[PDB]
Amino acid sequence: CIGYHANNSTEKVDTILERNVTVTHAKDILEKTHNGKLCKLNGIPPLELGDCSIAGWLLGNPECDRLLSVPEWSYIMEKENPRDGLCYPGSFNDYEELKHLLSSVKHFEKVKILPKDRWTQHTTTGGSRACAVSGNPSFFRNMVWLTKKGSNYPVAKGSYNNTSGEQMLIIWGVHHPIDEKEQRTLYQNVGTYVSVGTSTLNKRSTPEIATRPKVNGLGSRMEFSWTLLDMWDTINFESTGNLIAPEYGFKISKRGSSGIMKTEGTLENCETKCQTPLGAINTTLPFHNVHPLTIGECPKYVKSEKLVLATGLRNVPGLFGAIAGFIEGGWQGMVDGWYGYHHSNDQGSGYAADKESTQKAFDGITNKVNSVIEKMNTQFEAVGKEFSNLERRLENLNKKMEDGFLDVWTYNAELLVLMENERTLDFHDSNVKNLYDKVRMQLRDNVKELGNGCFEFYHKCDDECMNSVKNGTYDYPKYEE
Amino acid sequence: CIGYHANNSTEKVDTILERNVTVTHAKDILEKTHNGKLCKLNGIPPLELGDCSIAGWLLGNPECDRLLSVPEWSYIMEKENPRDGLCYPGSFNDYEELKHLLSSVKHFEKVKILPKDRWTQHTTTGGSRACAVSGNPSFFRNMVWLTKKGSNYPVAKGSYNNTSGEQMLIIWGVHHPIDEKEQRTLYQNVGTYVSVGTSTLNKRSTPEIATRPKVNGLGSRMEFSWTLLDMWDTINFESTGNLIAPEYGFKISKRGSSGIMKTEGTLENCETKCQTPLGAINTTLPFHNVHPLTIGECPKYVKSEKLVLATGLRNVPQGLFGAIAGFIEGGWQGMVDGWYGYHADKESTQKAFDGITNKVNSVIEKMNTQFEAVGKEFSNLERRLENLNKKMEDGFLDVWTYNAELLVLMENERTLDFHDSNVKNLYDKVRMQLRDNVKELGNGCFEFYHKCDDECMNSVKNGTYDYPKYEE
Amino acid sequence: DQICIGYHANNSTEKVDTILERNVTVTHAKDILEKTHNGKLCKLNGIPPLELGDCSIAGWLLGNPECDRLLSVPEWSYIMEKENPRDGLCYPGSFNDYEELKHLLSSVKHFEKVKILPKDRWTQHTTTGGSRACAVSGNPSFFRNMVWLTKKGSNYPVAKGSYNNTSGEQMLIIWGVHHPIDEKEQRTLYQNVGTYVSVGTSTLNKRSTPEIATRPKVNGLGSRMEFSWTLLDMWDTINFESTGNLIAPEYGFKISKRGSSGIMKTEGTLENCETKCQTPLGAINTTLPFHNVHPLTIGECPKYVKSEKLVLATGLRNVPQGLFGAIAGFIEGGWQGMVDGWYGYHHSNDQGSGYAADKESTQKAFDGITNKVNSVIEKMNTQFEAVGKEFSNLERRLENLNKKMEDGFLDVWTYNAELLVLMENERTLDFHDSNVKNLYDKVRMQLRDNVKELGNGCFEFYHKCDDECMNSVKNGTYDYPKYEEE
């Protein structure tokens, strides 16, 4: 008797042609588990900003004083709406761009470039209530609010030749008052400007005085801008009022660039190739469905709940008419493989598997499952991008495209599972119909072929004769009836 | 005798291996029909701008006075080149952005915020020939052209604390003259400015006086800008010349955001989940090819003329398993109660049918679809970006086409073979019952060596043949 | 006597993979991955590239004196720049909306330089302005295409100039603003101090103020020149007005276009060939749906894939000395001797041995495999893309959107094409298997009684089978007067 395997499994797969088909074995290829943790990424921690905006951190909001601050990070953790941004109300030009620039960094060191001391001739102690330090009027630790000394504001000049050996991120500001009287109180002079130069940059701001609602009590604003100073290049500042000067610069070496992850949680010291806001993924499968906003090298994100490839055969405690066919059902007793024999022997009967054809099948199904997994390229993407109020169009271009790929990968992967499942079942069917044939063509005359996949022997068949058939050696002196 | 179905069908499908193969049955999965109509979208009408640009509508070009104007729309209809834009020649900063913002809205109400009356101290009646109303010099209904009263233009001040309860779209302008003499005629003062403040916004414009060609007769221009005032926030205006002030604001609640559809036609009161400039699509198929510029939840747009899945079997009036068009040479037009039968096996016709039903569903149902706008807006200095969009839409067009074309072809070859296997299997089931008792003819017939009356014949269709026969 | 059904075999050591096996030697194959260029840069659809040598588009247009002798054609299809052209803005500066201008100029139907505000006519201002940095044979010179307006005597009267665009095509006009480092350099050149540079057309309205500021020296100058551009519509007028610091255009550029393409970063030079699809390593003259030459193509190209080989199997498994159990199955091995097709017979009898091929079923199979290989190739849409885009320093986010997307498509096409080859390979092998198991059956059902079926795909005849009887089996005509022996 020739037959196939069967077992306690209630696992269901779909094919193109049927659904809810119970199968002896399966392998889900949809990665759906995270570890609830935020982790290092390829051996390097994230910059952890707690509830500080990258603006507060850099500018040095006094409320950011005690942040981790590492010399090298791989992504950046912000909260969605950090609260601690520009304590003195304002704005920051090309902000989203700076954030992408800082998102990943090889080395990042703060360095004093235009020391506060040296601004003799101007007042340096300027501060506002809104940036309070223990109930005391303070200011952005990293900047210098240049105001009038006595009743005089001589041209302000300062420069810095970038010798540090790395490119440097320098940030500066312009103060916009609400009053041509606040303008005099601080700067005396009225028609002022704030000029800034390097080998590549040339900007000249004029203060824009204008009535404005109060934000943190102030109606005035401070407008910050930035630039990268190349190695061996010089930044030149010159103002006759309203300059907010940098005290420090930031050595910045990089790297490859990444992206910002919007989360509440905190670094937990683990390791992952692929980080998501719900947790890291340590996986090898080509698809996942944890969360869309990953950072690292991830499987393709898909809108699926399950992608269950069938590996084993139909479970029956096809296209070649054998499994669930002329061989009506499977054998739970044969457990040493997928296909096998049973024989009726007067010395006793039992369950022997064709290991030769179980090896073939198994090596094939292994290869199928590998094909599907290994041909899938994966590279380091950031996925979550930053956009301003005047970039909705662009933000949505990004969205239309991420949505575009979501649909491709879902349809393709869903169908891939279904087409390949119907193939597996049939492969198992063909393997059994072929075994049945191999056997049949050895016997012929000498057996009544029962039609349920059994052969009744017309002669005596002792164990040696039975192994002769599993051997592929049946031959063949018979005799009878 | 075992055999398969046949019929009058001349419908052709392709497979990977053959082409132009006549099949008993087929199901095109390419949606290629619209209804020539523009319709509501998910129960909500489009904003219908006629031939008004969003700039004219908002600014209130007098030529836009009588527009539909609904409190909630789902997309926006403009003509390609609306003609009625900035009747007083100029420009509008961040325009494309404003249009995307207005493309879809949950609630949109105009509201008077800085009433014309209250600008005592300045002249308010300013108008130009170019914005004529019945041959009469007029202006943007929604704005206030502040000029000098007598020979004096005192600082202009105005504010508005946004109490409406929704976020508000406020628009303002700056006038650039062509003459330091036009500049005096209207404003007296020469070194003027136009300052604007909110919690988040802070802008100060200076008028740029400069000789310029005439557009609508004027060489001067008006440069408009906008902002969204948050709830409970205040906008502050202050000018010493050249301000074009808003009279109204726009309450604007939204929503989800959509896009603008460039058409000539008009809303016809129907319903659709998916609108295209040629008409709406009421379809369930995963692919269409009506038009690239859809809005809504649509099938994937493909560069195909037909995607015809084969559902029935090869039509052979008079495969991979050697039965259909094989040892059983041709099909039977006589057997019409199913696909396979004797001389129909409803049991195996049901199996087959349920499978082919599932095939056709698999292909249709696994296709995700979501609300996309497709048609985007770009300025003259955004060609690079516009073309990024195009390279990508092109990118997806190629994927979906290649994939869907191949998908049809791979799955067709499978269907034919599936039918072939179904028949070779029927043939076998029967054969293994008879054996001895019949000469197997080889054309799929069995000649009985004994007598086979109707009960004996049902015994074979039953699966019950058994089996007292000793005849030769 | 005895007949025999079998399949083809040969000297081939070509391996394909399927979903189920790998490294499977096959009689025949067809790689569908285009991996060869011709090391050359070519015309594109019958039109040359603009060849900038080592000039930036800024230097070329502005007319850096170091760009004087460039090819300059009236119509190009893409643009060749070197990566870092060296000859850019010889007088240090910047150029607004530069990346956009480059995309605009990347492909052009007609492009003619035309003198619009002739140098002569700026009576009242000095015109000979030059700088050491733009030297011509050791002589202080300037951008050939611009006019450095400075003071005459000690007076700089308002500068005015206009041009009504009559040329008949849209015109690319470029202008500049000079930013000095000194309210003393500002006086030396322009006398006046609170100056401006105003520019107007039907659509454009810009007013620049010079920004004076201490700055590092670049090419020795601390001052800078900031250029901007616009397109003047037909019949429209550009108005210039300045009280100092204008760098005026002498020429305009008639520009008709077209369709727009992109810029190719290369070192080599145009070699006069032809290609529908150009890559920085060379042109591709191919018809296959995928290639892997280089990502930065321009023209109509196959989909770029991360593959080394995409080898479709066309012929059958090679077995010198499947899913239907025939090939590499009950018919244990293949025949190198049968060379007139894929499947055939061996018929042995007292008139000779000798292989026949079943040409009927070899034609079927071959027409099918031909169609397979065409399906895969022909259903692949292809259109004109540029692929290589231009982005400024403040556009890194955008540049990377482009990258994430090109990367997005790279993964789709690779996974899909890799898998496509594998799924279809397993289908071909099986298809050949089925063709043979079917031949074996067709034959078997004719014979029956009259032969011992050997089980290795041979039939030993129980009667005499002369050549006519053998052709009767290949014919499909075996019939059938035999009652030996028995």
PDB file of C-alpha atoms in Angstrom, chain A residues 29 94 96-97 100-101 157 193 195-205 226 228 233-238 258 286-287 300 320 360 363-365 367-383 385-388 391 394 397-398 401-402 405 408-409 412 416 419-420 423 426-427 430-431 434 437 440-441 444 476, chain C residues 17-22 92-94 179-181 183 209-218 222 224-226 306-307 309-310 317 322-326 330 392-416 418-419 422-423 426-427 430 433 437 440 444 452-457 462:
ATOM      1  CA  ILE A  29       6.593  34.525   6.313  1.00  0.00           C
ATOM      2  CA  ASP A  94      15.339  75.587   6.940  1.00  0.00           C
ATOM      3  CA  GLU A  96      13.418  70.368   8.602  1.00  0.00           C
ATOM      4  CA  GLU A  97      16.630  70.312   6.586  1.00  0.00           C
ATOM      5  CA  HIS A 100      17.640  65.554   8.458  1.00  0.00           C
ATOM      6  CA  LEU A 101      21.286  66.677   8.640  1.00  0.00           C
ATOM      7  CA  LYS A 157      32.188  92.362  14.519  1.00  0.00           C
ATOM      8  CA  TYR A 193      21.214  94.928   9.907  1.00  0.00           C
ATOM      9  CA  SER A 195      25.274  90.425   7.916  1.00  0.00           C
ATOM     10  CA  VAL A 196      26.892  86.981   7.734  1.00  0.00           C
ATOM     11  CA  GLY A 197      29.544  85.672   5.388  1.00  0.00           C
ATOM     12  CA  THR A 198      31.533  82.579   4.468  1.00  0.00           C
ATOM     13  CA  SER A 199      33.121  81.235   1.320  1.00  0.00           C
ATOM     14  CA  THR A 200      29.723  80.084   0.120  1.00  0.00           C
ATOM     15  CA  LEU A 201      27.152  81.901   2.271  1.00  0.00           C
ATOM     16  CA  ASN A 202      26.154  85.570   2.140  1.00  0.00           C
ATOM     17  CA  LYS A 203      23.093  86.691   4.067  1.00  0.00           C
ATOM     18  CA  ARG A 204      21.932  90.098   5.308  1.00  0.00           C
ATOM     19  CA  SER A 205      18.868  90.354   7.505  1.00  0.00           C
ATOM     20  CA  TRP A 226      22.273  78.098  10.193  1.00  0.00           C
ATOM     21  CA  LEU A 228      27.862  74.576   7.600  1.00  0.00           C
ATOM     22  CA  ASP A 233      36.722  78.505   6.000  1.00  0.00           C
ATOM     23  CA  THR A 234      35.807  81.626   7.941  1.00  0.00           C
ATOM     24  CA  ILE A 235      32.453  82.876   9.130  1.00  0.00           C
ATOM     25  CA  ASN A 236      32.157  86.659   9.396  1.00  0.00           C
ATOM     26  CA  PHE A 237      29.513  88.368  11.529  1.00  0.00           C
ATOM     27  CA  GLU A 238      28.768  92.071  11.303  1.00  0.00           C
ATOM     28  CA  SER A 258      19.143  58.530   8.661  1.00  0.00           C
ATOM     29  CA  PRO A 286      10.944  39.363   3.715  1.00  0.00           C
ATOM     30  CA  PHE A 287       7.766  41.012   5.017  1.00  0.00           C
ATOM     31  CA  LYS A 300       8.863  45.231   3.265  1.00  0.00           C
ATOM     32  CA  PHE A 320      -2.498  14.662  -9.927  1.00  0.00           C
ATOM     33  CA  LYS A 360      13.882  15.171  -2.408  1.00  0.00           C
ATOM     34  CA  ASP A 363      15.028  19.786  -0.079  1.00  0.00           C
ATOM     35  CA  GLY A 364      12.701  21.318  -2.622  1.00  0.00           C
ATOM     36  CA  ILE A 365      10.307  22.866  -0.079  1.00  0.00           C
ATOM     37  CA  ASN A 367      14.437  25.790  -1.433  1.00  0.00           C
ATOM     38  CA  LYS A 368      11.031  27.225  -2.123  1.00  0.00           C
ATOM     39  CA  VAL A 369      10.891  28.829   1.300  1.00  0.00           C
ATOM     40  CA  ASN A 370      14.413  30.160   0.804  1.00  0.00           C
ATOM     41  CA  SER A 371      13.797  31.496  -2.696  1.00  0.00           C
ATOM     42  CA  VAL A 372      10.910  33.573  -1.356  1.00  0.00           C
ATOM     43  CA  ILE A 373      12.970  34.840   1.589  1.00  0.00           C
ATOM     44  CA  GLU A 374      16.443  35.339   0.112  1.00  0.00           C
ATOM     45  CA  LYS A 375      15.673  37.070  -3.216  1.00  0.00           C
ATOM     46  CA  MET A 376      14.348  40.024  -1.275  1.00  0.00           C
ATOM     47  CA  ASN A 377      16.701  42.988  -1.277  1.00  0.00           C
ATOM     48  CA  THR A 378      16.666  45.241   1.745  1.00  0.00           C
ATOM     49  CA  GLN A 379      18.467  48.512   2.422  1.00  0.00           C
ATOM     50  CA  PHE A 380      18.724  51.267   4.983  1.00  0.00           C
ATOM     51  CA  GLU A 381      15.692  53.575   4.666  1.00  0.00           C
ATOM     52  CA  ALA A 382      14.390  56.227   7.102  1.00  0.00           C
ATOM     53  CA  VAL A 383      10.679  56.197   6.065  1.00  0.00           C
ATOM     54  CA  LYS A 385      10.355  62.406   6.842  1.00  0.00           C
ATOM     55  CA  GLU A 386       9.888  65.981   8.123  1.00  0.00           C
ATOM     56  CA  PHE A 387       7.809  68.667   6.368  1.00  0.00           C
ATOM     57  CA  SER A 388       6.848  72.294   7.078  1.00  0.00           C
ATOM     58  CA  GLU A 391       5.252  71.650   2.224  1.00  0.00           C
ATOM     59  CA  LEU A 394       5.605  67.470  -0.843  1.00  0.00           C
ATOM     60  CA  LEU A 397       4.076  63.100  -2.555  1.00  0.00           C
ATOM     61  CA  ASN A 398       6.038  61.058  -0.030  1.00  0.00           C
ATOM     62  CA  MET A 401       4.611  56.870  -2.886  1.00  0.00           C
ATOM     63  CA  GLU A 402       4.867  54.985   0.379  1.00  0.00           C
ATOM     64  CA  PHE A 405       4.713  50.598  -2.561  1.00  0.00           C
ATOM     65  CA  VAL A 408       2.507  46.672  -4.738  1.00  0.00           C
ATOM     66  CA  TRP A 409       4.080  44.663  -1.903  1.00  0.00           C
ATOM     67  CA  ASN A 412       2.371  40.830  -4.847  1.00  0.00           C
ATOM     68  CA  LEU A 416       2.876  35.101  -4.190  1.00  0.00           C
ATOM     69  CA  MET A 419       0.249  30.916  -6.235  1.00  0.00           C
ATOM     70  CA  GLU A 420       3.071  29.095  -4.470  1.00  0.00           C
ATOM     71  CA  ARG A 423       2.082  24.673  -6.319  1.00  0.00           C
ATOM     72  CA  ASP A 426       0.359  19.790  -6.228  1.00  0.00           C
ATOM     73  CA  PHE A 427       4.058  19.060  -5.823  1.00  0.00           C
ATOM     74  CA  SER A 430       2.843  14.578  -7.899  1.00  0.00           C
ATOM     75  CA  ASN A 431       5.455  13.126  -5.540  1.00  0.00           C
ATOM     76  CA  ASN A 434       5.007   9.166  -8.849  1.00  0.00           C
ATOM     77  CA  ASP A 437       3.859   4.620 -10.301  1.00  0.00           C
ATOM     78  CA  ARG A 440       3.313  -0.114  -9.885  1.00  0.00           C
ATOM     79  CA  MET A 441       5.684  -0.579 -12.803  1.00  0.00           C
ATOM     80  CA  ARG A 444       2.362  -5.423 -12.835  1.00  0.00           C
ATOM     81  CA  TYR A 476      10.626 -11.317 -10.018  1.00  0.00           C
TER      82      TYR A 476
ATOM     83  CA  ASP C  17      17.640  27.715 -10.978  1.00  0.00           C
ATOM     84  CA  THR C  18      13.991  26.999 -10.351  1.00  0.00           C
ATOM     85  CA  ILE C  19      11.868  27.511  -7.279  1.00  0.00           C
ATOM     86  CA  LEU C  20      12.541  23.896  -6.305  1.00  0.00           C
ATOM     87  CA  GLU C  21      16.120  23.120  -7.344  1.00  0.00           C
ATOM     88  CA  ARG C  22      19.257  25.058  -8.120  1.00  0.00           C
ATOM     89  CA  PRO C  92      32.924  84.166  -6.775  1.00  0.00           C
ATOM     90  CA  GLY C  93      29.226  84.164  -6.058  1.00  0.00           C
ATOM     91  CA  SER C  94      26.013  82.167  -6.364  1.00  0.00           C
ATOM     92  CA  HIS C 179      27.770  92.543  -3.250  1.00  0.00           C
ATOM     93  CA  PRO C 180      30.944  94.384  -2.188  1.00  0.00           C
ATOM     94  CA  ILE C 181      32.705  93.990   1.178  1.00  0.00           C
ATOM     95  CA  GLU C 183      31.091 100.846   2.004  1.00  0.00           C
ATOM     96  CA  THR C 209      19.468  95.437  -2.506  1.00  0.00           C
ATOM     97  CA  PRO C 210      23.223  94.860  -2.427  1.00  0.00           C
ATOM     98  CA  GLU C 211      24.329  93.138   0.788  1.00  0.00           C
ATOM     99  CA  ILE C 212      27.723  94.548   1.858  1.00  0.00           C
ATOM    100  CA  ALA C 213      29.577  92.339   4.362  1.00  0.00           C
ATOM    101  CA  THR C 214      33.061  91.168   5.313  1.00  0.00           C
ATOM    102  CA  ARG C 215      33.757  87.720   3.736  1.00  0.00           C
ATOM    103  CA  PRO C 216      36.639  85.287   3.159  1.00  0.00           C
ATOM    104  CA  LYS C 217      38.395  85.676  -0.183  1.00  0.00           C
ATOM    105  CA  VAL C 218      37.494  83.300  -2.984  1.00  0.00           C
ATOM    106  CA  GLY C 222      35.716  89.044  -0.900  1.00  0.00           C
ATOM    107  CA  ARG C 224      30.315  88.327  -4.596  1.00  0.00           C
ATOM    108  CA  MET C 225      28.008  88.387  -7.597  1.00  0.00           C
ATOM    109  CA  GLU C 226      24.545  86.902  -7.156  1.00  0.00           C
ATOM    110  CA  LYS C 306      20.504  44.249  -8.673  1.00  0.00           C
ATOM    111  CA  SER C 307      21.118  40.941 -10.500  1.00  0.00           C
ATOM    112  CA  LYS C 309      22.242  36.832 -14.109  1.00  0.00           C
ATOM    113  CA  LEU C 310      18.577  36.234 -14.952  1.00  0.00           C
ATOM    114  CA  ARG C 317      16.940  19.393 -18.312  1.00  0.00           C
ATOM    115  CA  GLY C 322      10.622  16.315 -12.813  1.00  0.00           C
ATOM    116  CA  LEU C 323       6.935  16.696 -11.916  1.00  0.00           C
ATOM    117  CA  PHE C 324       5.578  14.081 -14.333  1.00  0.00           C
ATOM    118  CA  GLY C 325       8.239  11.517 -13.440  1.00  0.00           C
ATOM    119  CA  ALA C 326       9.597  11.061 -16.926  1.00  0.00           C
ATOM    120  CA  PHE C 330      11.463   6.267 -15.382  1.00  0.00           C
ATOM    121  CA  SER C 392      20.854  72.003  -3.983  1.00  0.00           C
ATOM    122  CA  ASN C 393      22.317  72.030  -0.455  1.00  0.00           C
ATOM    123  CA  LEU C 394      18.949  72.876   1.069  1.00  0.00           C
ATOM    124  CA  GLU C 395      17.250  70.081  -0.832  1.00  0.00           C
ATOM    125  CA  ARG C 396      18.770  67.048   0.813  1.00  0.00           C
ATOM    126  CA  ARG C 397      15.356  65.880   1.987  1.00  0.00           C
ATOM    127  CA  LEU C 398      14.028  66.072  -1.550  1.00  0.00           C
ATOM    128  CA  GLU C 399      17.099  64.434  -3.079  1.00  0.00           C
ATOM    129  CA  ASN C 400      16.560  61.566  -0.680  1.00  0.00           C
ATOM    130  CA  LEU C 401      12.880  61.226  -1.504  1.00  0.00           C
ATOM    131  CA  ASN C 402      14.051  60.616  -5.089  1.00  0.00           C
ATOM    132  CA  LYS C 403      16.574  58.089  -3.777  1.00  0.00           C
ATOM    133  CA  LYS C 404      14.097  56.223  -1.531  1.00  0.00           C
ATOM    134  CA  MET C 405      11.856  55.866  -4.539  1.00  0.00           C
ATOM    135  CA  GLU C 406      14.465  54.768  -7.039  1.00  0.00           C
ATOM    136  CA  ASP C 407      15.544  52.323  -4.297  1.00  0.00           C
ATOM    137  CA  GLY C 408      11.896  51.381  -3.913  1.00  0.00           C
ATOM    138  CA  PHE C 409      11.649  50.408  -7.544  1.00  0.00           C
ATOM    139  CA  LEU C 410      15.017  48.708  -7.516  1.00  0.00           C
ATOM    140  CA  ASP C 411      13.737  46.282  -4.862  1.00  0.00           C
ATOM    141  CA  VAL C 412      10.429  45.593  -6.592  1.00  0.00           C
ATOM    142  CA  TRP C 413      11.978  44.849  -9.970  1.00  0.00           C
ATOM    143  CA  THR C 414      14.733  42.704  -8.493  1.00  0.00           C
ATOM    144  CA  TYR C 415      12.505  40.556  -6.228  1.00  0.00           C
ATOM    145  CA  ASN C 416       9.891  40.287  -8.966  1.00  0.00           C
ATOM    146  CA  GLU C 418      14.398  37.099  -9.671  1.00  0.00           C
ATOM    147  CA  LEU C 419      11.251  35.238  -8.648  1.00  0.00           C
ATOM    148  CA  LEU C 422      12.559  30.940 -10.818  1.00  0.00           C
ATOM    149  CA  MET C 423       8.863  30.291 -11.024  1.00  0.00           C
ATOM    150  CA  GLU C 426      10.331  25.273 -12.710  1.00  0.00           C
ATOM    151  CA  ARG C 427       7.454  25.507 -15.186  1.00  0.00           C
ATOM    152  CA  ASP C 430       7.911  20.413 -15.971  1.00  0.00           C
ATOM    153  CA  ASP C 433       8.538  16.499 -18.529  1.00  0.00           C
ATOM    154  CA  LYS C 437       5.278  11.594 -20.490  1.00  0.00           C
ATOM    155  CA  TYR C 440       5.264   7.985 -24.033  1.00  0.00           C
ATOM    156  CA  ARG C 444       1.769   3.243 -25.322  1.00  0.00           C
ATOM    157  CA  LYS C 452       6.205  -5.768 -23.346  1.00  0.00           C
ATOM    158  CA  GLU C 453       6.422  -2.387 -21.669  1.00  0.00           C
ATOM    159  CA  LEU C 454       9.947  -2.341 -20.239  1.00  0.00           C
ATOM    160  CA  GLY C 455       9.534   0.493 -17.703  1.00  0.00           C
ATOM    161  CA  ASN C 456      12.602   2.470 -18.844  1.00  0.00           C
ATOM    162  CA  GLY C 457      10.509   3.934 -21.641  1.00  0.00           C
ATOM    163  CA  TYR C 462       6.143  -9.246 -29.315  1.00  0.00           C
TER     164      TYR C 462
END
